[PDB]
Design a protein around this nucleic acid. Structure first.
Ligand SMILES: [Cl-]
Ligand SMILES: [Cl-]
Ligand SMILES: [Cl-]
Ligand SMILES: [Cl-]
Ligand SMILES: [Mn+2]
Ligand SMILES: [Mn+2]
Ligand SMILES: [Mn+2]
Ligand SMILES: [Mn+2]
Ligand SMILES: [Mn+2]
Ligand SMILES: [Mn+2]
Ligand SMILES: [Mn+2]
Ligand SMILES: [Mn+2]
Ligand SMILES: [Mn+2]
Ligand SMILES: [Mn+2]
Ligand SMILES: [Mn+2]
Ligand SMILES: [Mn+2]
Ligand SMILES: [Mn+2]
Lengths: 97, 104, 78, 92, 93, 108, 84, 97
DNA sequence: ATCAATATCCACCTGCAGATTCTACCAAAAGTGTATTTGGAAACTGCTCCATCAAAAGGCATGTTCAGCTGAATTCAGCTGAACATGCCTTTTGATGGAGCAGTTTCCAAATACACTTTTGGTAGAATCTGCAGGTGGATATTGA
DNA sequence: TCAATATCCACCTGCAGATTCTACCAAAAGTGTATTTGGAAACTGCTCCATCAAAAGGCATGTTCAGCTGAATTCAGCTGAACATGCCTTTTGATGGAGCAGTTTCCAAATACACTTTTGGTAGAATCTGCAGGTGGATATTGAT
């Protein structure tokens, strides 16, 4: 039975999602998250759908960029595997921490 | 007879002038200022559309989409610099895989 | 609801970010991060909504909120 | 009504690529782009005017602001176009 | 030709919070920079708020919102209290 | 003629409300300025000023100095997370940095 | 009336070392000094470019402290202490 | 004859310069550097003395901050020695390159 | 190194749903023609600052030697993380009803603008006041032997 | 435990730097019209939200294994520490003049205002292009020599 080696499909997926532009987080979960967070600041808020979409575009763009920086950090430590300390280093050098 | 036509521009000089006058930028606006500003906006626009259009043609689309704008912008050192902190909705990212990750 | 952001979603985002291999601990870490991000943005967004005396968060509220945090977003009403 | 830069972007597009179109969302992105750069140049021009205790924003402030805001070659061509447009306008 | 600055006010506030403490000229220069900076951040945000909502007036409401956007956490809450308290006392005459 | 009271004294403030009003008026922020806006702004600037002086003054006292210097301002700002956040992109001339040595660099 | 040349080399190895020390650095590769000179040069260029632009705009022949402060501000590096 | 081990004096110097606030680059060489660069944009410019000092405060602050980030990168790679690739990584994540 | 044998992309196809472009109507902006003001340039001009130069002492840059310890290279396997097949549930998508909000208009009471006239707080030096910087030495830690 | 160093830590005072004092006057404050404006009422259609339902497809799970990470080890230089030398930075003052501020005068350029023309936004119709699936060949990966 056929089996690709670990990493081959990963590389395939990198090519695939770097080629595409669609949102990568599922809509209903994100929206639910957004409303949950919004309740903590001010109550009985409504959202234009496009407001939710702006938030999702922004978040996914932010995470993808963070993962790029995180990856450069992993590689800097001669690793191919990203770890929390990579994220933490990237966020510190960005000024987020 | 429009100020735009007088300047040989497509971008609207009159609108730009009104936007300067109403934007709380200064008490007064000189006559050449919106002409100049409109010209600059038109130029940058034409630059981005030129590259984006090239990308749309290469993808054999007659229609420019956000993806083409992103490709155009990130592959140009100066546009990318100018738009460094900007997120292009539905633009995606440049295909780039760090060498170390490739097999062999 | 933060767990609603699933592991394969986070994996897909990392893939677009060029990542080949992912530690099991990343997912939870990413959630915390995402949460902080969202909190900050939505805080300001709602402030704009309140200032306009509205109960509906608009695209523009989000855009202004992103802009003031140095993360300009194009396409939603800039 | 709501105003946008759409018809002008479309005019410029037809100049550089006569047979090329643009999607609704790419037009949204071009509009954001124009508003952003307008705001950068205008508010820098405003600061220049204030720093020098002038109440008038003139093409000189716009030119300087462009020299501060645009990188390199982009700034050079922008300055060329601005100057050219103002000259053509002043002639008639 | 005279130059205006926030020095005397910074000094008054200093004497309030630390009656026996002084301040060097260069530290006073840094406080003046600080006041001008925060002034510009708040005023220009308030200006943006007013513009966004099609008002021609910057009111204490714009200043308050601007303060809530610009200041983190408790700093914002205390600033808002001080602002509010000063406007109410002021309106009382 | 009624004896003048300053807007600052009316607001119970040290910072100058009249000056702030004139500065709002002439900075082209808006066509009109409300009467309470320069009051509120002056009060916020005064508060933030008092906050930084309070912390800085404590730093100067711990170092047994009667005079606040840029070092104390910097100590006050970088050790206070919200102030450090607010002034994240700010350089304090002659402020130096917080003493901080990464653990791995120490001997054992 | 004396010609300025190659002054980036005036930023000495021990100056650079002191700067890294204040930055918490314990050990320094020999290649850092030249690298640091390049970085500093780029930084100074960008700042000075903008500063002089302000000076030219004001029709002045003297770069002021404020020219510098505005140039730093425009590049996202607000500097305190020089509003004198 | 007495000798400290390598790193003992380095550590002492870290404590010393972290405690102090004085400018670490010599004034006159910095001043020549500033004049050389500004003359190259426009000739016969003068400088207020405080303008040169503003530039020096800004440069040393920037470089010190850069060295902090660079140090975190070195340590992330299990090194105690900062190297060019550390500076380059820090600057890449800062957005400077 | 090359060679069969799968598995997955990727370019291409067609038929239409539906995005985009085209059209035509119409308030709202832009343009125009006069009339009036006014911000800011020119042109002197008095004083500051600024650039260069000079002196002289000693702080610090430089170049050198030598060796401690670091970075780089290597080896190995335990156990993490990837790949995959299954089957269940969450999300998508589609439909309906309704109410909660934005978005608009009109009209004044309230709020702000602005000129004119007084009145005082804020500033520029000048005069006065005084921390703390350097300069000492002795006590306490730290380092490396 | 002991030398060799380095770092604290208290103490002392005179002068560079900070604070206070003084008095003019620019800028706030008071007052009195003139102009705007924000917001209550009363609406009016859109979007949202809430609910409901089916079913697809994506996620969660468990198992297996390839290979990555981290630990352990070893060694050649690189970089830090220490020192002598001697240069060049630092401080401070002089000198001459360029360049800014400060002031006055007066138009070229900018605002104001009334009214007409022109245009840009908008929402359906008309046009035409991506795209959903499906194909077959193109490109890779795997496993084995
Ligand atoms: Cl980790
Ligand atoms: Cl002009
Ligand atoms: Cl108000
Ligand atoms: Cl390197
Ligand atoms: Mn107190
Ligand atoms: Mn008149
Ligand atoms: Mn005038
Ligand atoms: Mn020598
Ligand atoms: Mn020797
Ligand atoms: Mn090692
Ligand atoms: Mn194994
Ligand atoms: Mn008085
Ligand atoms: Mn001392
Ligand atoms: Mn004295
Ligand atoms: Mn038309
Ligand atoms: Mn019909
Ligand atoms: Mn398809």
């Amino acid at each position: 039975p056929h089996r690709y080696h670990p990493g081959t499909v990963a590389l395939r997926e990198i090519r695939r999602y770097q080629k595409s532009t669609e949102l990568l987080i599922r809509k209903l979960p994100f929206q639910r998250l957004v409303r949950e967070i919004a309740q903590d600041f001010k109550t009985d808020l409504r959202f234009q759908s496009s407001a939710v979409m702006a938030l999702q575009e922004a978040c996914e763009s932010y995470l993808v960029g963070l993962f790029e920086d995180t990856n450069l950090c992993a590689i800097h430590a001669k690793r191919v595997t990203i770890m929390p300390k990579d994220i933490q280093l990237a966020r510190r050098i960005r000024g987020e921490r | 007879k429009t100020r735009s036509s007088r300047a040989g521009l497509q971008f609207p000089v009159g609108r730009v002038h009104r936007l300067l006058r109403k934007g709380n930028y200064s008490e007064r606006v000189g006559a050449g200022a919106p002409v100049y500003l409109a010209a600059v906006l038109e130029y940058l626009t034409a630059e981005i559309l030129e590259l984006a259009g090239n990308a749309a043609r290469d993808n054999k689309k007659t229609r420019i989409i956000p993806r083409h704008l992103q490709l155009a912008i990130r592959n140009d050192e100066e546009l990318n610099k100018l738009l460094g902190r900007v997120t292009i909705a539905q633009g995606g990212v440049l295909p780039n895989i760090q060498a170390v990750l490739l097999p062999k | 609801n933060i767990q609603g952001i699933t592991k394969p979603a986070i994996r897909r985002l990392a893939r677009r970010g060029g990542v080949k291999r992912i530690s099991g601990l990343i997912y939870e870490e990413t959630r915390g991060v995402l949460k902080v991000f969202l909190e900050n943005v939505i805080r300001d967004a709602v402030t704009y909504t309140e200032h306009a005396k509205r109960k509906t968060v608009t695209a523009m509220d989000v855009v202004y909120a992103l802009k003031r945090q140095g993360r300009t977003l194009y396409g939603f009403g800039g | 009504r709501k105003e946008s830069y759409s018809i002008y972007v479309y005019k410029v597009l037809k100049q550089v690529h006569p047979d090329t179109g643009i999607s609704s969302k790419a037009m949204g992105i071009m509009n954001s782009f124009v508003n952003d750069i307008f705001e950068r140049i205008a508010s820098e021009a405003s600061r220049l005017a204030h720093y020098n205790k002038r109440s008038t924003i003139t093409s000189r402030e716009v030119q300087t602001a462009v020299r501060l805001l645009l990188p390199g070659e982009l700034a050079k061509h922008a300055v060329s176009e601005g100057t050219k447009a103002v000259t053509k306008y002043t002639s008639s």
